[PDB]
Amino acid sequence: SHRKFERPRHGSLGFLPRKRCKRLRGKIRSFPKDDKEKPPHFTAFMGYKAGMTHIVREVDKPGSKLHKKEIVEACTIIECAPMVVVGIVGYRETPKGLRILSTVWANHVSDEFRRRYYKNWYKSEKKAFTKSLNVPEATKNCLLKRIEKYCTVLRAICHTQPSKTPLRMKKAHIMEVQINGGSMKEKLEFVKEMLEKNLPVSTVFNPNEMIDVISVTKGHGTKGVVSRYGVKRLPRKTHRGLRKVACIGAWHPARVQFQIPRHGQKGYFHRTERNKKIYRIGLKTDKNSASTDADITEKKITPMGGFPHYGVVNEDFLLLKGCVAGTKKRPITLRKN
Amino acid sequence: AVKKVGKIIKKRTKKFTRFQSNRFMRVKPAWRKPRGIDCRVRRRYKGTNLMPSIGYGSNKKTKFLLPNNKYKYVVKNVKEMEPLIMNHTKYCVQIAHNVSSKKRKQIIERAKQMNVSVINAKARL
Amino acid sequence: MYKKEYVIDCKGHLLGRLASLIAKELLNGQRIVAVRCEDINISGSLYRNKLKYQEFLRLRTNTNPKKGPLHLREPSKILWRCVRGMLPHKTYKGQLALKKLKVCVGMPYPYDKKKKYVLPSALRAFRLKKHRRYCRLGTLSSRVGWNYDTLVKKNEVLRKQVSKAYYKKKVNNLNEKKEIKTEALNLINPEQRQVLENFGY
Amino acid sequence: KTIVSTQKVLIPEGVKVAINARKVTVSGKYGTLRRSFRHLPIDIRLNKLKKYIKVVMWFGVPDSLACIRTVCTHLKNMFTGVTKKFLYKMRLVHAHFPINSNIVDNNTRIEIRNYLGEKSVRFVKALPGVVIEKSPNVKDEIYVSGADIENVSLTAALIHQSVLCRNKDIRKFLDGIYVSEVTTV
RNA sequence: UUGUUUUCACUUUCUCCCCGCACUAAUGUGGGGAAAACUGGCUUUAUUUCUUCAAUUAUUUUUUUUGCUGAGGA
RNA sequence: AUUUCACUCAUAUUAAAUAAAAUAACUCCAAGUGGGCCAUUUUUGGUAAGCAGAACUGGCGAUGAGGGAUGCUCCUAACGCUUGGAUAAGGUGCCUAAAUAUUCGCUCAUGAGAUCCCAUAAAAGGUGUUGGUUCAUAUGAACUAGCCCUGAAAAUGGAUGGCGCUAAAGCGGA
RNA sequence: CCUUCGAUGUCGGCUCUUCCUAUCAUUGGGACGCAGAAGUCUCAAAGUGUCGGAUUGUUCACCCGCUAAUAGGGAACGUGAGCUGGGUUUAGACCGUCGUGAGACAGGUUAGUUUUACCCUACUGAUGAAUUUUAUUAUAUAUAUACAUAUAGUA
RNA sequence: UGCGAAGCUAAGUCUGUUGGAUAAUGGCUGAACGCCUCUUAAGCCAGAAACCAUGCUGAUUAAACAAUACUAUCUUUUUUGUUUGCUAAUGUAAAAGAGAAAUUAUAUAUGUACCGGUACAUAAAUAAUCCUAUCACCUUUUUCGUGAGCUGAGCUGUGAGCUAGGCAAUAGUUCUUUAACAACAAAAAAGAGCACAAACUGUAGACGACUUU
């Protein structure tokens, strides 16, 4: 018979299976839709979670009970050292999805980049990317012309520089940032110009801009159904323990449904959260990155005593309104809306 | 399927096996008529273990003879082979299993000079 | 039936009749390759067939939809599933027959350059009275969640342009060969010319 | 099932007609109209030097025969819309709140405001080959004109239906834009 | 409380005439009339390999290409 | 009434027909059984029931085989082991052997329909379409009955058996 | 009375999921005896939600109150190797009535042991090889090729 | 017992789209049915928390796949063969000419030429077609097309031919016509680096696995 009292189900079925993510790096499921009018531009970046602080800001919401007062907001610091653009990939549209035509590389790639191709870089002899970087400019330009002719989506392979961060990990994080903007030829030229130079956060994003964050949540191992799905604890008198779901299905169907909460892995999930506003893009060069016009004190973002469990933010960074999935030192992908 | 070798028709080969003897070790393959109540094989359900019936019986003109068109006769010594002296064309001989090597040799030589064929002629030698 | 492989242009055929003919051919052992599956027609209105596909979509094992009927939206896969339903696919021979079939949307690289055949007992033009409604499989698939219709269309227009160039070259070559033949017909001995003229060569 | 049934349409003076496999192109001093009748089994004969078009149906059942006159009326509508543009005169009636109509993008895209004092803009985009303008004689008038009767009448219907009243007595709250009359130019 | 007898009404035209006189689905057409007699129907003679000699049934006689089977041993 | 003598009433087809009618009749000894159930037709109680109780015959039981997708009881047909042949019931678009056969109508369904038992559908409606009937100076009505539509709502996801089928692979014939 | 009496754990609540629509609210409509406001009838619609408490073992009920609404149902009267054990339904005991009595009581009351998963599957998470009669929406300097192409290891 | 960093943690803080196509309904043009009619014909429009996408999660859910980086004695033609558990070695779901690339409409199409239109051709049992097969050898007379080496160009090889000539097949009547493709082994001839483990880490964790050095 029917439930005596209705109540919504525990947790969302849209985040199933609650299994461990395949990788540590956040991965863009889909890039923003390309607009042919805008000049070619990068659409994504990668930084590392340093920590969180709070800021004071003046509200400008007419009719809001706050309006003209100064409120405190929690902010997440993402250390964004410049990446290096190292490669170009062209995709064409086929009924079977996007197909790579080819990827062309830069003339020089850092050992930080080559390290990502090795499980044991220290004892190898680092032969990766050694004899394929001496391809003639004739065949490079041939491949680029074919990409311009037939490809409809352009992406730039770029990698982080973990040496500029306090991270112990040395191998860079590599991804491809889709170039959204003008024509195919303009995209090709736009990425060809900066085929080997640094890509700072300032070129990709602006202050006061809403972005999305893609990252892997903080892991917690296997958790009970109570802490994993929020189910209600059984009364204290329960014979074999109370931290469980009482009925895991009706008699029929003579099976357990996939919608029934169970124990299992909690955390270390891939999450794409929308609409985190950039509050400030702090620069490595300046000595007053954490100063304000109402502070005039010479100070940098790193809190007195270092960022706990992270280190010191010696590079470019951005101050994100709110919180971001992942632990400290986690790689965090930032994407344009 | 029937097999024909000259005038010899064997209406069936692959002798009948007891029902469920394949999947029970305590059930030997020797044929037993399933008495049963809802017994499938007894009811003659399609696709299972057909029962023997008299219709399979072989032609009685060729009922008992071996692939050599001769009836087998089992002998234990040289004196049991006297009747074949005037049946040598329609009877073949087979030496009994418990006959020693001398009696075996003697039987073989007597059968050869009676020109009566021997089935197990190369046993114990 | 007796060819190594039959390439069938599925444009303008009725889905069920095409599937029945293909199924019989595959079971008899003929490998067939079905191209332009997005242009298959189904009798009955687009809305009626969309309701049929919605009824199909509402169908899943409620304990685990991964195990459920996989729905498939590419029109090539819809044709493949129809043929499989016209087939004893759970036997070894039926599975071989099913795997002897290849389905495509559009005309990819090998099959755009081979002769495409057509089944008269399955064209809409021959099997449907004109005053009755029908639907296009590619359109149904797009309304159901395929979203590769326009891409296949533009690939098809490019292929048609290439084919038209090929046809012009072929027609010119045929005219040249015909002229060479008609000149040579006066150089063979009159008995040979007479035999060819008598038998229509 | 009647063996043969035909209907004849007269071609007016300044009209050029081209019919190929029941695809009809009518050109006149107010533009060119196109219309495909390939959904109907019709044998269309166009006499060019002696004008007139005859649509004939062989073996027509009443259901299909009902379409002969429909096709003929459509053809004559193309003729009249090409010789003298179709014109739908519309009146915007209002009880207490006047309706502000503004016509932009070259006599398309009419936007109205203050419908029941709603101070929200409702705009409609004219169909191809249709122009919307204010009448020069009577003020609460609107002219929806063009060569294609389907497009013109659909634009008039869109203007009428974009301004319907909700959650009130419709038979007392009568304000809205209504087709007052149909004519030509 | 049956028969028998009688009247007109029944055809083709690639014919003519009139009206619409180009109006039709039409290489024609709608409406109204005149015409013989190709067409169609009937009778006499000769013929049926120019052509027809059918269909059904009763009663008979063959024929093309071929599958399976060979009991027995007087 | 009985008994004895006479005379004689078809039989060479047999005191009507037909009859693998003597596979008879009779006696003895003895087994199991003595919960039945189902179908057609009839029928009682009950609102009804895959309900309870009876009559006839045939079945299931005790019995497989072909068909009805499936099924103790429906249809064909009952069974030694084979080779050929030809059929029954039922089918011939594919699953699946055989017709995308031929010929003539009807039907469009934004929940079509599709093999007795059999796997529900009614009262009441329709200016859907197809034929008929009877009244009205090619019109208007009123009826009639085919197919279609409404009436037509249930719980895991789902079933003319499935795919699918509309110049049918549906419905009624030939 | 068809299946279970060499046993399918028999009420309710708690917990949890899913389903139906005969829709309570929310969405968009039609009608009104529709001025407005409120409301009633009705359509497409099951995406979302349908509550806190007093008494009672209770389902039901009935009040207090919040709400936008506090709709109706199914899933072996969903759910006891998930609980609980208030009720029902053993043995102790009390009362009333009935009985000569032993005792009876859809009459009331009080106290009364709630067993087992380590198997298969399902479900939840976690490692992981192998995959040629296999695969291909191409590859080749405006031009050929399926009569082709494809090794494998790491990343 | 106070306080209590760190780490977990809610009662604390942050974040939670827009497109298509539709239903109901209201309409357009419009016959049936001179009028009318949203269609209870054909042909159209607008339209809902519904539907499908978008977006998000998984994808050993596809026993799926691509691009790239680096590398393993390695890679190409001919002959013979595949008739201690091993150390030469064979498999086909389908060769017998397995021959055939335009596109489209079905109450019509296609090419060409001018400016969708006009004109002219073509096709309309379309595969009921076309194309491809046998002329062996060797000698001579020679003609025309392609490849090596040489320098737009001479020669040699090759393919297709022309003239003339003389040279073969034979196994007893058929038992598959041993004829295809792909692979493999031997022998000749020519050229051609990683991962695990370990120690560390803790963004991870029941163990594996994962992130690292």
Side-chain angles (χ1 to χ4, degrees), chain C residues 16-17 20 24 43 48 60 62 82 86 126-127 132:
Chain C
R17 305 221 138 81
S20 191
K24 202 38 177 168
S43 56
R48 174 168 192 84
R60 80 234 182 102
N62 92 98
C82 196
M86 250 148 284
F126 283 88
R127 311 279 341 161
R132 265 156 184 155

Short mmCIF file of all heavy atoms in Angstrom, two decimals, chain C residues 16-17 20 24 43 48 60 62 82 86 126-127 132, chain F residues 93-95 110 112 156 163 165-169:
data_model
loop_
_atom_site.label_atom_id
_atom_site.label_comp_id
_atom_site.label_asym_id
_atom_site.label_seq_id
_atom_site.Cartn_x
_atom_site.Cartn_y
_atom_site.Cartn_z
N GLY C 16 9.86 -1.49 -42.36
CA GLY C 16 9.56 -2.88 -42.10
C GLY C 16 9.81 -3.79 -43.29
O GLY C 16 10.34 -4.89 -43.14
N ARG C 17 9.41 -3.35 -44.48
CA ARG C 17 9.64 -4.15 -45.67
C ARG C 17 11.13 -4.29 -45.97
O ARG C 17 11.61 -5.38 -46.31
CB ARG C 17 8.89 -3.54 -46.84
CG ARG C 17 7.42 -3.35 -46.58
CD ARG C 17 6.64 -3.72 -47.81
NE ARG C 17 5.44 -4.49 -47.51
CZ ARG C 17 4.29 -3.96 -47.12
NH1 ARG C 17 4.16 -2.67 -46.94
NH2 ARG C 17 3.26 -4.76 -46.89
N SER C 20 12.53 -6.78 -43.52
CA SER C 20 12.19 -8.16 -43.85
C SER C 20 13.07 -8.69 -44.97
O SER C 20 13.61 -9.80 -44.88
CB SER C 20 10.72 -8.25 -44.22
OG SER C 20 10.30 -9.59 -44.32
N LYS C 24 15.91 -11.76 -44.54
CA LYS C 24 15.95 -13.00 -45.32
C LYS C 24 17.29 -13.15 -46.02
O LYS C 24 17.87 -14.24 -46.04
CB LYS C 24 14.81 -13.05 -46.32
CG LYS C 24 14.48 -14.46 -46.77
CD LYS C 24 14.60 -15.41 -45.61
CE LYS C 24 14.20 -16.81 -45.99
NZ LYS C 24 14.59 -17.78 -44.95
N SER C 43 5.50 4.31 -42.80
CA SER C 43 4.12 4.70 -43.03
C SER C 43 3.49 5.19 -41.74
O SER C 43 3.88 4.79 -40.64
CB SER C 43 3.32 3.53 -43.61
OG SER C 43 3.40 2.39 -42.78
N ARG C 48 2.48 10.14 -35.09
CA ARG C 48 2.11 8.79 -34.70
C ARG C 48 3.35 7.94 -34.44
O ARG C 48 3.43 7.23 -33.43
CB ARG C 48 1.24 8.17 -35.79
CG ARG C 48 0.90 6.74 -35.60
CD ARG C 48 -0.18 6.30 -36.56
NE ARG C 48 -0.71 5.00 -36.18
CZ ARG C 48 -1.65 4.82 -35.26
NH1 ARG C 48 -2.22 5.84 -34.66
NH2 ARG C 48 -2.01 3.58 -34.95
N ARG C 60 11.83 0.33 -19.56
CA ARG C 60 13.13 0.05 -18.98
C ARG C 60 12.95 -0.80 -17.74
O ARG C 60 11.93 -0.71 -17.05
CB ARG C 60 13.87 1.34 -18.65
CG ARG C 60 13.45 2.01 -17.36
CD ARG C 60 13.07 3.46 -17.58
NE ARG C 60 12.71 4.11 -16.33
CZ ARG C 60 13.50 4.93 -15.65
NH1 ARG C 60 14.70 5.26 -16.10
NH2 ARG C 60 13.08 5.42 -14.49
N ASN C 62 12.99 -1.36 -14.22
CA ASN C 62 12.94 -0.32 -13.20
C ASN C 62 13.94 -0.57 -12.09
O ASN C 62 14.28 0.37 -11.37
CB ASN C 62 11.53 -0.19 -12.65
CG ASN C 62 11.29 -1.04 -11.45
OD1 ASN C 62 11.37 -0.57 -10.32
ND2 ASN C 62 11.04 -2.31 -11.68
N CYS C 82 15.47 -3.21 -35.99
CA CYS C 82 14.34 -3.80 -36.68
C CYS C 82 14.73 -5.11 -37.36
O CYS C 82 14.02 -6.12 -37.25
CB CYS C 82 13.78 -2.80 -37.69
SG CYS C 82 12.14 -3.17 -38.29
N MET C 86 13.52 -9.05 -36.73
CA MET C 86 13.10 -9.96 -37.79
C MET C 86 14.02 -11.17 -37.94
O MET C 86 14.02 -11.81 -38.99
CB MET C 86 13.00 -9.21 -39.12
CG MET C 86 11.60 -9.03 -39.60
SD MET C 86 11.31 -7.54 -40.54
CE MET C 86 11.27 -6.37 -39.22
N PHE C 126 6.08 2.74 -54.36
CA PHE C 126 5.34 1.59 -54.84
C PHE C 126 4.45 0.97 -53.78
O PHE C 126 3.53 0.23 -54.15
CB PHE C 126 6.31 0.53 -55.36
CG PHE C 126 6.87 0.84 -56.70
CD1 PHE C 126 8.01 1.60 -56.82
CD2 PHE C 126 6.25 0.38 -57.84
CE1 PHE C 126 8.52 1.89 -58.06
CE2 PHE C 126 6.76 0.68 -59.08
CZ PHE C 126 7.90 1.43 -59.19
N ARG C 127 4.68 1.24 -52.50
CA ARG C 127 3.93 0.55 -51.47
C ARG C 127 2.93 1.42 -50.72
O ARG C 127 2.12 0.87 -49.97
CB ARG C 127 4.89 -0.09 -50.47
CG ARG C 127 5.99 -0.90 -51.12
CD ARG C 127 5.52 -2.27 -51.51
NE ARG C 127 4.32 -2.67 -50.80
CZ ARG C 127 3.52 -3.64 -51.20
NH1 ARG C 127 3.75 -4.32 -52.31
NH2 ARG C 127 2.45 -3.95 -50.47
N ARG C 132 -1.68 9.12 -48.30
CA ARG C 132 -1.53 8.63 -46.95
C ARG C 132 -0.22 9.11 -46.35
O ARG C 132 0.74 9.42 -47.06
CB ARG C 132 -1.62 7.11 -46.90
CG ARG C 132 -3.03 6.72 -46.57
CD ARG C 132 -3.42 5.36 -47.01
NE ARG C 132 -4.83 5.18 -46.70
CZ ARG C 132 -5.63 4.34 -47.33
NH1 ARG C 132 -5.19 3.54 -48.29
NH2 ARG C 132 -6.91 4.29 -46.99
P G F 93 2.95 -14.09 -46.53
OP1 G F 93 1.87 -13.77 -45.57
OP2 G F 93 2.66 -14.15 -47.97
"O5'" G F 93 4.11 -13.04 -46.32
"C5'" G F 93 5.08 -12.81 -47.32
"C4'" G F 93 6.22 -11.98 -46.79
"O4'" G F 93 5.69 -10.83 -46.09
"C3'" G F 93 7.08 -12.67 -45.75
"O3'" G F 93 8.06 -13.50 -46.33
"C2'" G F 93 7.66 -11.50 -44.97
"O2'" G F 93 8.76 -10.94 -45.66
"C1'" G F 93 6.51 -10.51 -45.00
N9 G F 93 5.69 -10.50 -43.78
C8 G F 93 4.38 -10.86 -43.68
N7 G F 93 3.90 -10.72 -42.49
C5 G F 93 4.96 -10.22 -41.75
C6 G F 93 5.04 -9.88 -40.39
O6 G F 93 4.15 -9.93 -39.54
N1 G F 93 6.29 -9.41 -40.06
C2 G F 93 7.33 -9.29 -40.92
N2 G F 93 8.46 -8.82 -40.40
N3 G F 93 7.28 -9.61 -42.19
C4 G F 93 6.07 -10.07 -42.54
P C F 94 8.66 -14.72 -45.50
OP1 C F 94 9.60 -15.45 -46.37
OP2 C F 94 7.54 -15.42 -44.84
"O5'" C F 94 9.52 -14.02 -44.37
"C5'" C F 94 10.76 -13.41 -44.67
"C4'" C F 94 11.40 -12.90 -43.42
"O4'" C F 94 10.56 -11.88 -42.83
"C3'" C F 94 11.54 -13.92 -42.32
"O3'" C F 94 12.65 -14.78 -42.48
"C2'" C F 94 11.61 -13.06 -41.07
"O2'" C F 94 12.89 -12.45 -40.97
"C1'" C F 94 10.61 -11.97 -41.42
N1 C F 94 9.25 -12.25 -40.92
C2 C F 94 8.97 -11.97 -39.60
O2 C F 94 9.88 -11.53 -38.90
N3 C F 94 7.74 -12.18 -39.11
C4 C F 94 6.80 -12.65 -39.91
N4 C F 94 5.59 -12.84 -39.38
C5 C F 94 7.04 -12.95 -41.27
C6 C F 94 8.27 -12.73 -41.73
P C F 95 12.51 -16.30 -42.03
OP1 C F 95 13.77 -16.99 -42.35
OP2 C F 95 11.23 -16.80 -42.58
"O5'" C F 95 12.36 -16.21 -40.45
"C5'" C F 95 13.45 -15.74 -39.67
"C4'" C F 95 13.05 -15.48 -38.24
"O4'" C F 95 11.95 -14.54 -38.18
"C3'" C F 95 12.55 -16.65 -37.44
"O3'" C F 95 13.57 -17.54 -37.04
"C2'" C F 95 11.85 -15.96 -36.29
"O2'" C F 95 12.80 -15.47 -35.35
"C1'" C F 95 11.23 -14.76 -36.99
N1 C F 95 9.80 -14.98 -37.31
C2 C F 95 8.89 -14.72 -36.29
O2 C F 95 9.33 -14.32 -35.22
N3 C F 95 7.58 -14.90 -36.50
C4 C F 95 7.17 -15.32 -37.68
N4 C F 95 5.87 -15.49 -37.85
C5 C F 95 8.07 -15.60 -38.74
C6 C F 95 9.37 -15.42 -38.52
P U F 110 -3.89 8.99 -35.21
OP1 U F 110 -4.56 10.00 -36.05
OP2 U F 110 -2.72 8.27 -35.73
"O5'" U F 110 -3.48 9.77 -33.89
"C5'" U F 110 -3.09 9.07 -32.71
"C4'" U F 110 -3.11 9.98 -31.50
"O4'" U F 110 -2.19 11.08 -31.72
"C3'" U F 110 -4.45 10.62 -31.18
"O3'" U F 110 -4.55 10.84 -29.78
"C2'" U F 110 -4.35 11.97 -31.88
"O2'" U F 110 -5.21 12.96 -31.36
"C1'" U F 110 -2.88 12.31 -31.64
N1 U F 110 -2.30 13.22 -32.63
C2 U F 110 -1.81 14.42 -32.18
O2 U F 110 -1.85 14.74 -31.02
N3 U F 110 -1.27 15.22 -33.14
C4 U F 110 -1.18 14.94 -34.49
O4 U F 110 -0.67 15.76 -35.24
C5 U F 110 -1.71 13.68 -34.87
C6 U F 110 -2.24 12.88 -33.95
P A F 112 -3.73 4.01 -32.00
OP1 A F 112 -2.68 3.02 -32.31
OP2 A F 112 -3.56 5.41 -32.43
"O5'" A F 112 -5.09 3.47 -32.61
"C5'" A F 112 -5.48 2.12 -32.44
"C4'" A F 112 -6.44 1.73 -33.53
"O4'" A F 112 -5.84 2.03 -34.80
"C3'" A F 112 -6.81 0.26 -33.61
"O3'" A F 112 -7.88 -0.04 -32.74
"C2'" A F 112 -7.17 0.07 -35.08
"O2'" A F 112 -8.53 0.42 -35.30
"C1'" A F 112 -6.32 1.13 -35.77
N9 A F 112 -5.18 0.64 -36.56
C8 A F 112 -3.86 0.91 -36.35
N7 A F 112 -3.06 0.42 -37.25
C5 A F 112 -3.92 -0.20 -38.14
C6 A F 112 -3.70 -0.91 -39.32
N6 A F 112 -2.49 -1.13 -39.82
N1 A F 112 -4.77 -1.39 -39.97
C2 A F 112 -5.98 -1.17 -39.46
N3 A F 112 -6.31 -0.52 -38.36
C4 A F 112 -5.23 -0.05 -37.74
P U F 156 3.32 -2.24 -10.16
OP1 U F 156 2.80 -3.52 -10.68
OP2 U F 156 3.37 -2.02 -8.70
"O5'" U F 156 4.80 -2.09 -10.70
"C5'" U F 156 5.50 -0.86 -10.58
"C4'" U F 156 6.84 -0.92 -11.27
"O4'" U F 156 7.54 -2.11 -10.82
"C3'" U F 156 6.78 -1.02 -12.79
"O3'" U F 156 7.95 -0.42 -13.32
"C2'" U F 156 6.84 -2.52 -13.01
"O2'" U F 156 7.27 -2.91 -14.29
"C1'" U F 156 7.83 -2.93 -11.93
N1 U F 156 7.72 -4.33 -11.51
C2 U F 156 8.76 -5.17 -11.82
O2 U F 156 9.74 -4.81 -12.43
N3 U F 156 8.61 -6.46 -11.40
C4 U F 156 7.55 -6.97 -10.70
O4 U F 156 7.56 -8.16 -10.40
C5 U F 156 6.51 -6.05 -10.41
C6 U F 156 6.64 -4.78 -10.81
P C F 163 7.15 -5.81 -30.88
OP1 C F 163 7.54 -4.64 -30.08
OP2 C F 163 5.74 -6.02 -31.25
"O5'" C F 163 8.02 -5.80 -32.21
"C5'" C F 163 9.43 -5.67 -32.16
"C4'" C F 163 10.06 -6.02 -33.48
"O4'" C F 163 9.60 -7.32 -33.91
"C3'" C F 163 9.72 -5.10 -34.65
"O3'" C F 163 10.50 -3.92 -34.67
"C2'" C F 163 9.96 -6.00 -35.85
"O2'" C F 163 11.34 -6.09 -36.11
"C1'" C F 163 9.50 -7.35 -35.32
N1 C F 163 8.10 -7.68 -35.69
C2 C F 163 7.88 -8.27 -36.92
O2 C F 163 8.83 -8.47 -37.66
N3 C F 163 6.63 -8.60 -37.29
C4 C F 163 5.62 -8.37 -36.46
N4 C F 163 4.41 -8.73 -36.86
C5 C F 163 5.82 -7.78 -35.19
C6 C F 163 7.06 -7.45 -34.85
P C F 165 6.80 -0.71 -40.55
OP1 C F 165 7.57 -0.06 -41.62
OP2 C F 165 6.23 0.09 -39.45
"O5'" C F 165 5.61 -1.50 -41.23
"C5'" C F 165 5.84 -2.37 -42.33
"C4'" C F 165 4.58 -3.12 -42.66
"O4'" C F 165 4.13 -3.82 -41.49
"C3'" C F 165 3.41 -2.25 -43.06
"O3'" C F 165 3.44 -1.94 -44.43
"C2'" C F 165 2.20 -3.09 -42.65
"O2'" C F 165 1.92 -4.06 -43.65
"C1'" C F 165 2.73 -3.82 -41.42
N1 C F 165 2.33 -3.20 -40.15
C2 C F 165 1.09 -3.46 -39.59
O2 C F 165 0.30 -4.19 -40.19
N3 C F 165 0.78 -2.89 -38.41
C4 C F 165 1.65 -2.11 -37.80
N4 C F 165 1.31 -1.57 -36.63
C5 C F 165 2.93 -1.84 -38.33
C6 C F 165 3.22 -2.41 -39.50
P U F 166 3.34 -0.43 -44.94
OP1 U F 166 3.74 -0.41 -46.36
OP2 U F 166 4.00 0.46 -43.96
"O5'" U F 166 1.79 -0.14 -44.92
"C5'" U F 166 0.91 -0.98 -45.64
"C4'" U F 166 -0.48 -0.41 -45.71
"O4'" U F 166 -0.97 -0.18 -44.36
"C3'" U F 166 -0.59 0.93 -46.43
"O3'" U F 166 -1.80 0.97 -47.18
"C2'" U F 166 -0.66 1.93 -45.29
"O2'" U F 166 -1.31 3.13 -45.61
"C1'" U F 166 -1.43 1.14 -44.25
N1 U F 166 -1.20 1.62 -42.88
C2 U F 166 -2.28 1.72 -42.05
O2 U F 166 -3.40 1.40 -42.37
N3 U F 166 -2.01 2.20 -40.81
C4 U F 166 -0.80 2.61 -40.33
O4 U F 166 -0.72 3.02 -39.18
C5 U F 166 0.28 2.49 -41.25
C6 U F 166 0.04 2.01 -42.47
P A F 167 -1.89 1.83 -48.53
OP1 A F 167 -0.91 2.94 -48.45
OP2 A F 167 -3.31 2.15 -48.72
"O5'" A F 167 -1.45 0.83 -49.69
"C5'" A F 167 -2.44 0.08 -50.38
"C4'" A F 167 -1.97 -0.54 -51.68
"O4'" A F 167 -1.86 0.46 -52.73
"C3'" A F 167 -0.64 -1.30 -51.66
"O3'" A F 167 -0.81 -2.55 -52.32
"C2'" A F 167 0.28 -0.43 -52.50
"O2'" A F 167 1.29 -1.14 -53.18
"C1'" A F 167 -0.70 0.20 -53.47
N9 A F 167 -0.21 1.45 -54.06
C8 A F 167 0.94 2.13 -53.75
N7 A F 167 1.13 3.21 -54.46
C5 A F 167 0.03 3.23 -55.30
C6 A F 167 -0.36 4.13 -56.29
N6 A F 167 0.34 5.21 -56.61
N1 A F 167 -1.51 3.87 -56.94
C2 A F 167 -2.21 2.77 -56.60
N3 A F 167 -1.94 1.85 -55.68
C4 A F 167 -0.80 2.15 -55.07
P A F 168 -1.21 -3.86 -51.48
OP1 A F 168 -0.78 -5.05 -52.24
OP2 A F 168 -2.62 -3.73 -51.06
"O5'" A F 168 -0.30 -3.78 -50.19
"C5'" A F 168 -0.82 -3.32 -48.95
"C4'" A F 168 -0.37 -4.19 -47.81
"O4'" A F 168 -0.62 -3.50 -46.56
"C3'" A F 168 -1.10 -5.53 -47.70
"O3'" A F 168 -0.23 -6.47 -47.10
"C2'" A F 168 -2.20 -5.20 -46.71
"O2'" A F 168 -2.77 -6.32 -46.07
"C1'" A F 168 -1.45 -4.31 -45.75
N9 A F 168 -2.29 -3.46 -44.90
C8 A F 168 -2.21 -3.41 -43.54
N7 A F 168 -3.08 -2.61 -42.99
C5 A F 168 -3.78 -2.10 -44.07
C6 A F 168 -4.84 -1.20 -44.14
N6 A F 168 -5.39 -0.62 -43.08
N1 A F 168 -5.32 -0.90 -45.36
C2 A F 168 -4.76 -1.48 -46.42
N3 A F 168 -3.76 -2.35 -46.47
C4 A F 168 -3.31 -2.62 -45.25
P A F 169 0.68 -7.46 -47.98
OP1 A F 169 1.89 -6.73 -48.38
OP2 A F 169 -0.16 -8.08 -49.01
"O5'" A F 169 1.10 -8.58 -46.94
"C5'" A F 169 0.13 -9.46 -46.37
"C4'" A F 169 0.12 -9.40 -44.86
"O4'" A F 169 1.48 -9.35 -44.38
"C3'" A F 169 -0.58 -8.18 -44.27
"O3'" A F 169 -1.12 -8.54 -43.00
"C2'" A F 169 0.58 -7.22 -44.05
"O2'" A F 169 0.34 -6.24 -43.07
"C1'" A F 169 1.67 -8.18 -43.61
N9 A F 169 3.02 -7.69 -43.88
C8 A F 169 3.62 -7.62 -45.09
N7 A F 169 4.83 -7.17 -45.04
C5 A F 169 5.05 -6.94 -43.70
C6 A F 169 6.15 -6.45 -43.01
N6 A F 169 7.29 -6.09 -43.60
N1 A F 169 6.04 -6.34 -41.68
C2 A F 169 4.90 -6.70 -41.10
N3 A F 169 3.80 -7.17 -41.64
C4 A F 169 3.94 -7.27 -42.97
#
